[PDB]
């Protein structure tokens, strides 16, 4: 146990597509989405 060092260093190597890469990775864990019955409010 020590408070001398900073442990939030992983965010120093985040590229431009890190957020969307993580979203693509997470896409396989989600539940199926509900459907309103139409493709669009203009349908």
């Amino acid at each position: 146990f020590d408070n001398s060092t900073y442990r939030n260093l992983q965010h120093h190597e985040y590229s431009t597509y890190t957020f969307l890469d993580l979203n693509v990775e997470l896409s396989k864990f989600r539940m199926p989405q509900p459907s309103s019955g139409r493709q669009s409010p203009r349908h």
Binding site: S36, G37, R38, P41, R42
Partner: protein
Amino acid sequence: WSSTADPLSNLVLTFSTKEDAVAFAEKNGWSFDVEERKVPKPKSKSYGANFSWNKRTRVSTK
């Protein structure tokens, strides 16, 4: 300029009811045509309908 030859071109009379106007026209000898009042029918307005979950009334902008 614009000339006219009849004297009743600017004559507009105001009445409270249709029956009163009919009586005036009848006693003054004029032949009349009457049109019934056009009242706008009540509407069904709803602000929430702009954000419907599955209905076409949902708006795409504000």
